[PDB]
A paper describes a structure:
The [name] ([name]) is a component of the [name] maltose/maltodextrin system, which regulates the uptake and catabolism of maltrodextrins as part of the chemotactic response. Subsequently, this tendency to crystallize has been further increased by an [name] version engineered to reduce surface entropy13(MBPeng). Here we report two passenger protein sequences that promote the formation of an intimately interlaced dimeric form of MBPeng, featuring the largest interface area observed to date for domain-swapped proteins. The fragments of interest being relatively short (28 and 49 residues for FAK(residues 805–832) and PYK2(residues 790–839), respectively), we decided to produce them as C-terminal [name] fusion proteins.
To understand the molecular basis for the observed dimerization, we crystallized the protein fractions corresponding to the dimeric species of MBPeng-KFLFAK and of MBPeng-KFLPYK2. MBPeng-KFLPYK2 crystals also formed in P1, however with different cell parameters, and diffracted to 3.2 Å resolution. The six KFLPYK2-fused [name] molecules were in the closed maltose-bound conformation, as expected given that 2 mM maltose were included in all purification and crystallization buffers. During model rebuilding and refinement, it became apparent that adjacent [name] molecules formed the same intricately interlaced arm-exchange dimers in both MBPeng-KFLFAK and MBPeng-KFLPYK2 crystals, (harbouring two and three dimers per ASU, respectively). Instead of a tight β-turn at residues 173–176, the protein chains adopted an extended β-strand structure, crossing straight into the second [name] structure for both MBPeng-FAKKFL and MBPeng-KFLPYK2. This β-strand pairing is stabilized by six intermolecular backbone hydrogen bonds between residues 171 and 178 of both chains. Because [name]’s polypeptide chain goes back and forth between its N-terminal and C-terminal lobes, this chain crossing resulted in highly intertwined dimers, where the two domains of both [name] molecules are constituted by both polypeptide chains. This structural architecture produced an extremely high contact surface between both chains (~11,300 Å2), corresponding to a calculated solvation free energy gain (∆iG) of −174.5 kcal/mol. Following structural refinement, clear electron density was only found for the Asn-Ala linker and the first (in the KFLPYK2 crystal) or the first five (KFLFAK) passenger protein residues. [name] is a close homologue of [name] [name] (94.32% sequence identity), and with an RMSD of 0.35 Å over 365 residues [name] was the closest structural match in the PDB to our dimer-swapped MBPeng-KFLPYK2.
Residue numbers in the entry:
A (entry chain B), B (entry chain A): 3 to 371
The structure:
Amino acid sequence: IEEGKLVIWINGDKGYNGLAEVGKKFEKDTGIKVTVEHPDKLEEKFPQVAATGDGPDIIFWAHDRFGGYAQSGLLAEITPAAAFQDKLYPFTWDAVRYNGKLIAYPIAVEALSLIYNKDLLPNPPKTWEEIPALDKELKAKGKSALMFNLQEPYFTWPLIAADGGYAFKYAAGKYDIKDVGVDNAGAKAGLTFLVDLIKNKHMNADTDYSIAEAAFNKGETAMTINGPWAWSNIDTSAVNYGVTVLPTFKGQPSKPFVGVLSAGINAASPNKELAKEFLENYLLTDEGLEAVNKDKPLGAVALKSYEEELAKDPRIAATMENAQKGEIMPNIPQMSAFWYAVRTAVINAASGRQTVDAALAAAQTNARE
Amino acid sequence: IEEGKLVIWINGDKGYNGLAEVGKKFEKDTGIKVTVEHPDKLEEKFPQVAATGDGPDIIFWAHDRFGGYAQSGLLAEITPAAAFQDKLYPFTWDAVRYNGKLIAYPIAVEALSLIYNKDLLPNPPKTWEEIPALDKELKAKGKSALMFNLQEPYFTWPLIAADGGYAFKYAAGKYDIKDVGVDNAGAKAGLTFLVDLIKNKHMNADTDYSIAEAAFNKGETAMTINGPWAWSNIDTSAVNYGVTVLPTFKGQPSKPFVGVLSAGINAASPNKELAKEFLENYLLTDEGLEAVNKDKPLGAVALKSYEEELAKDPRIAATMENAQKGEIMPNIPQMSAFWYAVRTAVINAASGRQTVDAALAAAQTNARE
Ligand SMILES: OC[C@H]1O[C@H](O[C@H]2[C@H](O)[C@@H](O)[C@@H](O)O[C@@H]2CO)[C@H](O)[C@@H](O)[C@@H]1O
Ligand SMILES: OC[C@H]1O[C@H](O[C@H]2[C@H](O)[C@@H](O)[C@@H](O)O[C@@H]2CO)[C@H](O)[C@@H](O)[C@@H]1O
């Protein structure tokens, strides 16, 4: 492959002439020649040549082939700025993400359509089952009902998949409830640091929600850790406060468990419709959420409309920054057992009833049950 | 629980008076009284009472508890219309999805942040490690560096998780390359229907891309199945055509494999920067994509700006309708083996060299090797 040139492969059925024009402008601007080719079976050829360090600088194809190319080490990992990545839909980036790395730029989403001649057939059939009859009608006019590519499985697949054909089954992401990471070295280091703060009287083991809030809001302490709901009381307070990213530990960002405030309907409630009505039509509106939010801030609401408006708040922006650095909380049943286990571990380690090692090791065992 | 009333539980730290006001409006509109309560330990109480068929009509909590509630059969499965579901961010719906069912309405996302008093501390510490020193300084002023709730593990967890603490390890959703669904009854039914169309001379097994396109564009056939790239040639043709949803089979929507045309960069290319420049700055622009699109339509482009403009096209709308009913293609290496397997099966079944059963059974084995 020549340096200071760009060779592009794209399939013949796509607008390679249009791409070539983009190449002409690139050449005009940069003096770098851009050669667009559409070889036969380019998608089969590319691996073969690319293995040998030869072939095009850029290959165009549906993403489905690229995992294979990546796995063979034929694709360079792409590194677009976050700014650029935001310009494309995330699901298209998912298509080109292989083993965590981006391996291609998404370009366009292609799906088969039923294309019909309005002059022969003003209302196309809504079922496949109608087509034989339609064909009978049309054959009497020396026409046929339907013809499409039967050589490529891509074209016949929609009908094959229709009643439950699939390629490979997608396994849901499970949670390993035997993989507990409370007693690993990361947890130990973190908690040890916390215990050390207490030991050096920088913090008091006795501190609870009330004490912490009152101390911060009385301007007795420089900083607190708390969620959106807390802001109301700080606004009440004469304290001029900022809401920011959590501090790093060992150069890693603090990783808060993210909650989704959520409204469940009692299975035993005879008022399910009413519950549905209230939540859907009253609470989950700009007006409803604003009412709650005005009392105590919710944070980043789940309703897109109001959230967009709320996101202007730098406190909410900080909320979301910390959210992204942290993890959404599992909703599995074992979560309560996990919480209880860590609660006890922290308390006992902080109070000095137990060492960090022993406390966490105990939590490990408790959380696993 | 009493019918024709609504009892709501929400934690005391959230804005329950504001919620109550939403309840007052609901009552005004519907005459249904809404009682908002904030019991102590409501999250522990709810399961207890709910088991007995009693408790609030609606329970509010972070999603983390709801899996547990669901598992105990305390929550009614919620059924919002797709229209409503689109109004909330999907990741919040994920939080409330348990064993495939929605079990709660997501309300708002909460994350702990560092809150600091700008008047005491204009620049908050970017690391935990600075805090001891900061505290020393502040104690000499009769203040402390940090105080927060140590009694709830939620507050200490960010530091514990920071350096690699985790609850339970989350296993990413795999693709099972041993679970192949080409020879299931849905695939058999679909392909059988196709073979039957050929057997009844409604279609010719020999029909390929060229033949199909030429036939439709010459107004010889009522319908073809094809992608956006095909439209150019039909516009050229005097044919008056529409682009629509694929027909249903056995009252199921056709499920086309969705491809994302994507551009990968050759790992062996010395021109990687140039490739990056061209793709990012020339192709993936309104202008670049318009150039390609004008030659042969791309469909729904991945670039948000241009896509929004393109979406006005009813052909693209139909494209997206079909896309949503179908599935994005896996990008895994085994995809090529899958395609090859189906290609052969279809050809052999259509040509009549093999029966649908034998062809698909063979494809099954070939796809899983
Ligand atoms: O067939 C033309 C059309 O389909 C393509 O799908 C291919 C797939 O990408 C290949 O790897 C192949 O082995 O099987 C499929 C067709 O059976 C492309 O996805 C698409 O862009 C192209 O226009
Ligand atoms: O702790 C109060 C504050 O955090 C909560 O997180 C809880 C969790 O929800 C509970 O079930 C518990 O066992 O563990 C965590 C605290 O350890 C809520 O998620 C949050 O909204 C609440 O305001």
